[PDB]
């Protein structure tokens, strides 16, 4: 108990101690970059001690450790919600962060402001952890903005690049829009209900919670980059790759779904939210892949490749799977973030080249890079027993074997195969074929530090996702019984994506001229949603402002 | 990215070696300062192809206006040396 709670709160305060050392003193320069990493390394250990106790005891502890404010009949505190999600989502985030931690200590050697770089990387981590552990909307709101702001600087690290300034505000524009539902939700729980503490919210079990949940639906629309407020998520790839690896691949993007899960007791009864959320992911989960089938940017493609995974997570919640969707969060983060780092290896040896068509001949010229690229893809595509398959097979269970919209299941599998399609298009140019990079060879990855970074993040997907399944205790009645094809439909359509893309990929070798096609451009040009909605809408708001 | 250094002496053959694979030139007649149109008996349309190879060779675009005047290998070296600020 005491030991469990006490040792748990150290991580949030422990992580902040290096930050307190940046605003004060000048004792030891040139060593902070390692200082932070070891703290996470140490933090991870203190993030695993709660792991043991929680699994054995399942001790969900809400700790109110202050009396901040008090209005008539309200009270705010700097409390934390030590429960399943924090105990199980924190270890993964640090694990990924720990990998990314040492990844960035090498890639950004070209930045004199590297020390500043870490002055914010550690900041975001703090806010994200506070967000998930938050017991109240307000404190939860704070993290909802910290991720919003910490992204602003990290997104726009190179403030000179016009893409950063435009993209950074594009996301901030969207990120703020999502909060409209968030602030609305607080108002409703303050008017109809009377508090922002989840204890009262769940226990009272609202009978008409359409409005508060509708705000939650909007919250995830922009923050998690769902369709309708999606375009910004790819836009983050105009800046540092390590920055994209954590914020927009593993940590910030998970915010949108997280709130719905954290309000699981309320979301169950109202199916109005479920349908639109179920449909919202449906339109997004394919619109991301449908667009992604022909995109030609290594970093953006990964963003779209991440987008579809996120788009499907909403469907997982849309099918009323509270704790099963949670797994998809951790499982996806491992490799995809590693893929960002792997994409870093490609960009490193390429000396600032990113076009997918300017890559190849890397199977043996990039042996280590080739090593982990397939696992993430195979795990991403749903290779059995791998980190991504567990969710992919499990998640498709209820959706295809429980009450769901007819059209909802339609795009559910069409894009599912597309998930593997671009992976083959990627590993093809990335690894298959003879080299196509510029004449001079800058290829070198005999860097021990990165190998440590790749080592740590290569292992987790292979084994950690498998391990994570065992310890977690029962919370649901698994639908182990279903028609064999439905149980194996993923096991049926999975191989189709590789082959179908392989059918598409190899026929392009032949020396035959090309032919334009509208759909080839509709998906390639992002469905024209960004190309249009990011011209007129700025023009409407601004060109019409003067009058 | 450790260090991608650049040296004028090392770059010397990089511009010239590009010409060493051309199928419209005798390698031995070619010189460091040889004008392409007259000394090498070439044309602007032929000269366009050489300029393009430098972009695949080194990896950086070339403006249309300044591409034409680079009729001397030294000038091409000057463009590469001067644009990247390489002096030794």
């Amino acid at each position: 108990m005491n030991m469990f709670s006490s040792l748990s709160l150290v991580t949030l305060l422990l992580l902040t101690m290096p930050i307190m050392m940046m605003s004060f003193n000048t004792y030891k320069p040139s060593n902070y970059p390692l200082y932070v990493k070891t703290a996470i390394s140490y933090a991870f250990i203190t993030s695993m001690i709660p792991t043991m106790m929680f699994i054995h005891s399942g001790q969900e502890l809400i700790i109110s450790n202050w009396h901040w404010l008090t209005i008539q009949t309200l009270k705010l505190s700097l409390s934390f919600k030590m429960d399943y999600f924090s105990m199980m989502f924190i270890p993964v985030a640090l694990f990924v962060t720990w990998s990314i931690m040492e990844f960035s200590m090498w890639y950004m050697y070209s930045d004199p402001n590297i020390n500043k770089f870490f002055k914010y990387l550690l900041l975001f981590l703090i806010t994200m952890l506070i967000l998930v552990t938050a017991n109240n909307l307000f404190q939860l709101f704070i993290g909802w903005e910290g991720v919003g702001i910490m992204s602003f600087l990290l997104i726009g690290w190179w403030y000179g690049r016009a893409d950063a300034n435009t993209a950074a505000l594009q996301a901030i524009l969207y990120n703020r829009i999502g909060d409209i539902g968030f602030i609305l939700a607080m108002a409703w729980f303050l008017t109809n209900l009377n508090t922002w503490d989840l204890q009262q919210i769940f226990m009272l079990n609202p009978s008409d919670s359409n409005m508060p949940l509708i705000g939650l639906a909007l919250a995830a629309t922009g923050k998690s980059a769902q369709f309708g407020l999606h375009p910004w998520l790819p836009s983050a790839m105009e800046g540092p790759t390590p920055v994209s690896a954590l914020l927009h691949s593993s940590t910030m993007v998970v915010a949108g779904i997280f709130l719905l899960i954290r309000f699981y007791p309320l979301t169950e009864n109202n199916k109005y939210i479920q349908s639109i959320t179920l449909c919202l992911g449906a339109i997004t989960t394919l619109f991301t892949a449908m667009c992604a089938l022909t995109q030609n940017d290594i970093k953006k493609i990964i963003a779209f490749s991440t987008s579809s995974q996120l788009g499907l997570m909403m469907v997982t919640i849309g099918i009323n799977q509270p704790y099963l969707a949670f797994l998809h969060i951790c499982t996806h983060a491992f490799f995809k973030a590693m893929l960002f780092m792997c994409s870093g290896s490609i960009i490193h040896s390429l000396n600032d080249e990113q076009d997918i068509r300017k890559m190849g001949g890397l199977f043996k010229a990039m042996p280590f890079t080739t090593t982990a690229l397939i696992v993430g893809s195979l795990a991403l595509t749903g290779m059995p027993f791998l980190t991504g398959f567990y969710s992919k097979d499990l998640i498709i269970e209820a959706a295809n074997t429980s009450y769901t919209n007819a059209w909802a299941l339609l795009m559910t599998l069409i894009a599912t195969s597309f998930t593997a399609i671009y992976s083959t298009r990627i590993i093809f140019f990335a690894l298959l074929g003879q080299p196509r990079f510029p004449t001079l060879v800058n290829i070198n990855e005999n860097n021990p530090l990165l190998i440590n970074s790749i080592k740590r993040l290569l292992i987790g997907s292979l084994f950690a996702g498998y391990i994570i399944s065992n310890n977690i205790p029962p919370t649901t009645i698994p639908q182990m019984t279903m028609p064999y094809y439905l149980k194996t439909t993923a096991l049926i359509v999975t191989i189709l994506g590789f082959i179908l893309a392989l059918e598409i990929s190899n026929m392009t070798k032949n020396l035959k001229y090309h032919y334009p096609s509208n759909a080839f451009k509709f998906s390639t040009l992002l469905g024209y949603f960004p190309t249009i909605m990011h011209r007129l809408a700025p023009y409407m708001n601004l060109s019409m402002s003067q009058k | 990215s450790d260090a991608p250094p650049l040296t004028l002496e090392g770059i010397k053959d990089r511009v010239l070696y590009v010409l060493k694979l051309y199928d419209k030139i005798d390698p031995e007649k070619l010189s460091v300062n040889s004008h392409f149109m007259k000394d090498l008996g070439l044309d602007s349309l032929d000269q366009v192809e050489i300029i393009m190879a430098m972009e695949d060779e080194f990896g950086f675009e070339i403006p249309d206006i300044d591409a034409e005047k680079l009729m001397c290998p030294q000038e091409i070296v000057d463009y590469i040396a001067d644009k990247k600020d390489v002096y030794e």
């Binding site: 042996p367 004449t439 001079l440 060879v441 800058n442 290829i443 070198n444 005999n446 | 260090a3 990089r14």
Partner: peptide, 17 residues
């Protein structure tokens, strides 16, 4: 940077280890 333990090539397979 141990003294250029890898010597880059030009139009060649990498000088790996």
């Amino acid at each position: 940077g141990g003294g250029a333990h890898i010597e880059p090539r030009y139009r060649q397979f990498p000088q790996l280890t």
